[PDB]
Amino acid sequence: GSHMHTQVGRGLLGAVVNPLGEVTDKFAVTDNSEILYRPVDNAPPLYSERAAIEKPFLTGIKVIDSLLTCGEGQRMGIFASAGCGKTFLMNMLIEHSGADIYVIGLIGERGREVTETVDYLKNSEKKSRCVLVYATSDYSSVDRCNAAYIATAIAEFFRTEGHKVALFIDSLTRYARALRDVALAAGESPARRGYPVSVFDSLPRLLERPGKLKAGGSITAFYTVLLEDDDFADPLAEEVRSILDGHIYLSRNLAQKGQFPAIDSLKSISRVFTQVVDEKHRIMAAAFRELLSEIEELRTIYNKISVVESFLKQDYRLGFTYEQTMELIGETIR
Ligand SMILES: [Mg+2]
Ligand SMILES: [Mg+2]
Ligand SMILES: [Mg+2]
Ligand SMILES: [Mg+2]
Ligand SMILES: [Mg+2]
Ligand SMILES: [Mg+2]
Ligand SMILES: [Mg+2]
Ligand SMILES: [Mg+2]
């Protein structure tokens, strides 16, 4: 029973907040200083309170805005091994999208990693729209957990205000590991992979707090899962794969090969694709995948590779409008 409240409001915009609710850096100063307190534990919305996911959440990233289109209110998994560009991708998603407010939660990262992110925010137009909650690796399992809840809570308040909120949580694997430790310390039995069954049981309550509301406002959430290399095939990834509305997988093959972002579209899916894009889009996109699968058949030892790879590849500094992306799609299937 967390009776613990935390600060929420426009006064946090620009702020870097720690697991104890105090501000330790800024990447922007905000003209408003609204601060209220709100509970860090909160039930997800009632089913009757949710709106259908129908309007797309545009990312300004060609390959996902076209083949893996996201909806406002959705929850999307990001599954990456190390050094495959995951943090560049998170930063792309923040930069080239159109949310009113971005809440980021970094869980158990090294202080260098939290600084990468803060550095990014300090040089970005979104600086006045973001809040960063972190728990560096010198913090306790409890503090790491509360970092995730504080992040969600702040998002929740901005959603109740009406805003289109984007929530990023990096990582769920360190959140789960911290939750595990808390559970072992309370004396419960380890199920498969040393995790007490309660860590996986609690996930839905955390991961279903996002969504779009009838009353106005939405949280669209991106959750990171750090993969090992073919190690145990990964219980947590599977759980997340099943709880969420789709998953983007970052490929090693594509990462070493220079193909950034290293998004493998074969291993990826938005489970709300059908219902956030045109009939026209579906067909153009379906045609692009056909073009892909066939280009993959040549990769077993024609000229439309350069043009396609040029479509996929995208420097983290560039954002493409939906029209631009679809414009580009049209020329590769014509
Ligand atoms: Mg786009
Ligand atoms: Mg990151
Ligand atoms: Mg400490
Ligand atoms: Mg709350
Ligand atoms: Mg994991
Ligand atoms: Mg583990
Ligand atoms: Mg499945
Ligand atoms: Mg239609």
The residue from 256, 277, 298 where one domain ends is: 277
**Listed residues: CB within 5 A of ion ligand 3:** 138-139
Residue 164 contacts residue 156 (beta carbons within 8 Å): no
| Co-location of 64 and 104 in the same domain | yes
Based on the structure, what is the number of domains in the chain? 2
Please state, in angstroms and rounded to a whole number, the distance separating the CA atoms of residues 94 and 101.
10
Taking the CA of 241 as reference, the closest ligand is 7
* Residues less than 5 Å from ion ligand 2, measured at CB: 87, 90, 170
Expressed in angstroms and rounded, the spacing between residue 202 Cα and the centre of ligand 3 is 25
Of 34, 37, 74, nearest to 54 (Cα)?
74
Give yes or no: residues 28 and 46 share one domain: yes
Are 156 and 190 members of one domain?
A: yes
Tell me the C-alpha distance between 34 and 222, whole Å.
Answer: 26
Task: Tally Cβ neighbours within 10 Å of residue 251.
Answer: 21
| Structural domain boundaries, residue 322 | 278-334
Method by which this entry was solved: X-ray
d(CA 108, CA 194) in angstroms, rounded, equals 19
Give me the phi and psi of 249, to 5 degrees please. -105, 125
The tokens for 32 are 């408003």
Per-residue three-class SS string for the chain: CCCCEEEECHHHCCEEECCCCCEEEECCCCCCCCCEEEECCCCCCCHHHECCCCCEECCCCHHHHHHCCEECCCEEEEEECCCCCHHHHHHHHHHCCCCCEEEEEEEEECHHHHHHHHHHHHCCHHHHCEEEEEEECCCCHHHHHHHHHHHHHHHHHHHHHCCEEEEEEECHHHHHHHHHHHHHHCCCCCCHHHCCHHHHHHHHHHHCCCEEECCCCEEEEEEEEECCCCCCCCHHHHHHHHHCCEEEEECHHHHHCCCCCCECCCCCEECCCCCCCCHHHHHHHHHHHHHHHHHHHHCCCCCCHHHHHHHHCCCCCCCCCHHHHHHHHHHHCC
Asked if 334 and 240 sit in the same domain, the reply is no
| Contacts (Cβ under 8 Å, ≥6 apart) of 214 | 49, 50, 51
Tell whether 249 and 284 lie within a shared domain.
no
Give the number of the ligand closest to the Cα of residue 268: 7
**Alpha-carbon span 106 to 28, nearest angstrom:** 18
Distance from residue 168's CA to the centre of ligand 6 (Å): 21
- 87 annotated binding-site participant: yes
Is 83 labeled as ligand-binding?
A: yes
The resolution in Å comes to: 2.5
Q: Does 86 count as an annotated binding residue? A: yes
